[PDB]
Amino acid sequence: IVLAASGVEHEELLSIAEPLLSDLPNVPRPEEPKSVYTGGDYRCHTESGHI
Amino acid sequence: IVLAASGVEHEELLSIAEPLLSDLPNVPRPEEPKSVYTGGDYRCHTESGHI
């Protein structure tokens, strides 16, 4: 989670958002999901009213 | 056009069907439509409610 502000001073954003977010638990992040780039073809002759 | 009967004597089928089919005109037949066997793949992941 990342909180990002534009037009706010950094000491204002810590007087508000720090007492409301500090007690979420520290957990290990998971492993990032994997995939591989194969090739591929795809085609769909369109829905039967289009033409 | 071919008329085909099963259980009828051949001289009965000519007393009925001949005075009604003899005056169609004699025309040349057309050329028979052509195609070639290529290969091919096809796939359709099924309609979205079937699984």
Side-chain angles (χ1 to χ4, degrees):
Chain A
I1 300 179
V2 163
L3 187 71
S6 152
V8 175
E9 295 178 355
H10 192 69
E11 293 309 321
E12 170 151 45
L13 193 72
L14 261 62
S15 176
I16 313 298
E18 200 264 349
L20 299 176
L21 277 175
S22 78
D23 54 319
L24 286 171
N26 201 346
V27 299
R29 294 188 78 168
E31 295 295 327
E32 189 205 12
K34 312 289 202 237
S35 56
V36 301
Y37 181 73
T38 74
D41 179 285
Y42 175 84
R43 56 182 62 193
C44 177
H45 199 94
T46 185
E47 184 65 29
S48 296
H50 273 244
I51 134 90
Chain B
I1 299 179
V2 163
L3 187 71
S6 152
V8 174
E9 15 131 7
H10 192 69
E11 293 309 320
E12 170 151 45
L13 193 72
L14 261 62
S15 176
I16 313 298
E18 200 264 349
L20 296 178
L21 275 175
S22 78
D23 54 319
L24 286 171
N26 201 346
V27 299
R29 294 190 80 169
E31 295 295 327
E32 189 205 12
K34 312 289 202 237
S35 56
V36 301
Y37 181 73
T38 74
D41 179 285
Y42 175 84
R43 56 182 62 193
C44 177
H45 199 94
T46 185
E47 184 65 29
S48 296
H50 289 191
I51 341 171

